[PDB]
Ligand binder design. Sequence first.
Ligand SMILES: NS(=O)(=O)c1ccc(NC(=O)Cc2cccs2)cc1
Ligand SMILES: [Zn+2]
Length: 257
Amino acid sequence: HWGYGKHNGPEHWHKDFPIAKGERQSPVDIDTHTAKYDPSLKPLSVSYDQATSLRILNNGHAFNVEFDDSQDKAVLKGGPLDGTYRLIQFHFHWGSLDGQGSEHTVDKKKYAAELHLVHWNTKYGDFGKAVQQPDGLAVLGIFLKVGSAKPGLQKVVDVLDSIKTKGKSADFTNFDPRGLLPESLDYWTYPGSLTTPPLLECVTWIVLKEPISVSSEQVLKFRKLNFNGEGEPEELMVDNWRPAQPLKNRQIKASFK
Ligand SMILES: NS(=O)(=O)c1ccc(NC(=O)Cc2cccs2)cc1
Ligand SMILES: [Zn+2]
């Protein structure tokens, strides 16, 4: 099946998922000089105060912190979005080295990792229906650079030992995703896709301009995870990122001057 190795990696995905070569694929390089300020873009509304985290899961491609999305508890609104998008999970992509790991790039610069907070449009009833719609998902992307520790990330780091291998999960309640945000909510936005198979073209991407900083020890713990299941040959979960795809007929808009 698909993955991030030499034989099943991003260059191979198109054979099972032809949309890999589609018109609105993600991630992309954000050329800061070509992005256009859109003064009509509304401020982002991040309402995470009632967030209910449930569980953390190693799915063999990344780890997801999952949320109760059966009510409007943690929602994203505003910005380029019409309507209400519920937080269903977040996860990260990261590198084997600090100089790579992010999926989006900024003027070709790669960050050490990238956080994706995944939300779905409530007008479609459930996540499975939403991914079938061009405005079904909104993913808030946040870059990570290595420097000072991110205190709000530490709870996540400390449970990773319990979900080392594919298919392992652990209770993960009472986690506050607000602790993963940078100070500024200035963003770029463009229409795009899931960055892993099935690569569905259903995502409004909202990528924050300001990265968060995490410590070397924090990212090192990400890199101790495994792609494999328990009792299979050990393959470190690193470099689980798709490279930038062609922008094609799209304009990246900026919320800031
Ligand atoms: N890296 S990303 O674009 O944020 C992303 C988010 C979610 C998924 N996949 C799923 O949530 C699982 C799916 C269920 C039904 C269709 S895809 C893949 C990539
Ligand atoms: Zn992702």
